[PDB]
Design a protein around this ligand. Sequence first.
Ligand code: GDP
Ligand code: GDP
Ligand code: ZN
Ligand code: ZN
Ligand code: ZN
Ligand code: ZN
Lengths: 174, 174
Amino acid sequence: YSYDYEYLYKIVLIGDSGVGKSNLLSRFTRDEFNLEGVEFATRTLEIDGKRVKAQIWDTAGQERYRAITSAYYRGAVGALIVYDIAKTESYESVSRWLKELKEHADANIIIELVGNKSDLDHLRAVPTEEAKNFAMENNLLFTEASALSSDNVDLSFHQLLKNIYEMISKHQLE
Amino acid sequence: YSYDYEYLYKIVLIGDSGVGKSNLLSRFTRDEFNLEGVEFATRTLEIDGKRVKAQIWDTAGQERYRAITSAYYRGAVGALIVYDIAKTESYESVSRWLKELKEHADANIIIELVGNKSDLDHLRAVPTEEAKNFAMENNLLFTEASALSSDNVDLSFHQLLKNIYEMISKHQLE
Ligand SMILES: Nc1nc2c(ncn2[C@@H]2O[C@H](COP(=O)(O)OP(=O)(O)O)[C@@H](O)[C@H]2O)c(=O)[nH]1
Ligand SMILES: Nc1nc2c(ncn2[C@@H]2O[C@H](COP(=O)(O)OP(=O)(O)O)[C@@H](O)[C@H]2O)c(=O)[nH]1
Ligand SMILES: [Zn+2]
Ligand SMILES: [Zn+2]
Ligand SMILES: [Zn+2]
Ligand SMILES: [Zn+2]
């Protein structure tokens, strides 16, 4: 048998404007997607037998013109860095978002690199192997996804929460 | 170092009308007490290094005339059975509340017996040793408390949440 309790994880979504952060959230939490306020959404799912309440934060679009404030990252245990596989610029900015996390987020936050818009294969600018190699180099989890076609969307969120739970537990047997 | 995450525990308060359930809640969550809606309150505190968000439920007084519905107990990991040390009847009803928990609450809910109104020592009807012996007999945690004078109030809630966390963890090394 198992006891009746929940884990509270705060996750933040970061990345350049237009990479599909808000559509990743609406696809995972409400299964909706829009071709071009709601501060965060919560979905609860089972991770290795345990119930995990994931509170996933999303921007209001201010990252297009200014830097995200420190309060956005506070309390977050995981983070998704989203880029556009069809936009090189959005992939080059991954280092900037890594700087943002080191500067305002928890020192041991668990990071996952997400390559969104995998449906635009005719416009692919960033090869999967380049970003996958970069993720392992910087000890980030990695997947490509498509909020439009729902490919690997649940995988991007389940992979991070599963790694958070296991990395926490593994850290607990000190 | 420790990761940034929380545990969500639902706790319910049960006992006969007038034993001091609502005043136990206001004393622990808001440090207020009244001499003779708000469905539940949440207070977060540190249990053995970890952060535990306790959601403590309280009745609207319907237990005076009818039985508490099943939905009140659903999801609860712990429960406080409160009686009046100055009212024998309220102590005799502890078996009824144990029946209520077996009937509508989780099969492995952790129960604590609380003897409230310890300040009315001139009116003591239930000796501490009788209820303490009864609690160990039925594998309940036990303390006396006074919502009026704040004695053992934080102890009654901290003792239960600490036992819940450790009993869960101890159950986890299957
Ligand atoms: N083709 C495609 N377009 C997407 C995808 N995800 C988002 N978009 C589009 O990208 C634009 C910006 O998306 P949005 O979620 O607002 O990006 P955000 O600024 O990071 O939140 C929208 O017009 C979406 O239609 C995807 O997986 N595939
Ligand atoms: N002397 C004393 N009176 C108390 C204590 N706790 C509650 N009361 C009184 O008992 C009455 C009923 O308390 P209440 O919290 O509403 O009981 P409930 O029905 O179980 O919620 C109130 O008038 C309180 O003033 C206590 O620790 N000591
Ligand atoms: Zn957005
Ligand atoms: Zn910054
Ligand atoms: Zn009450
Ligand atoms: Zn019943």
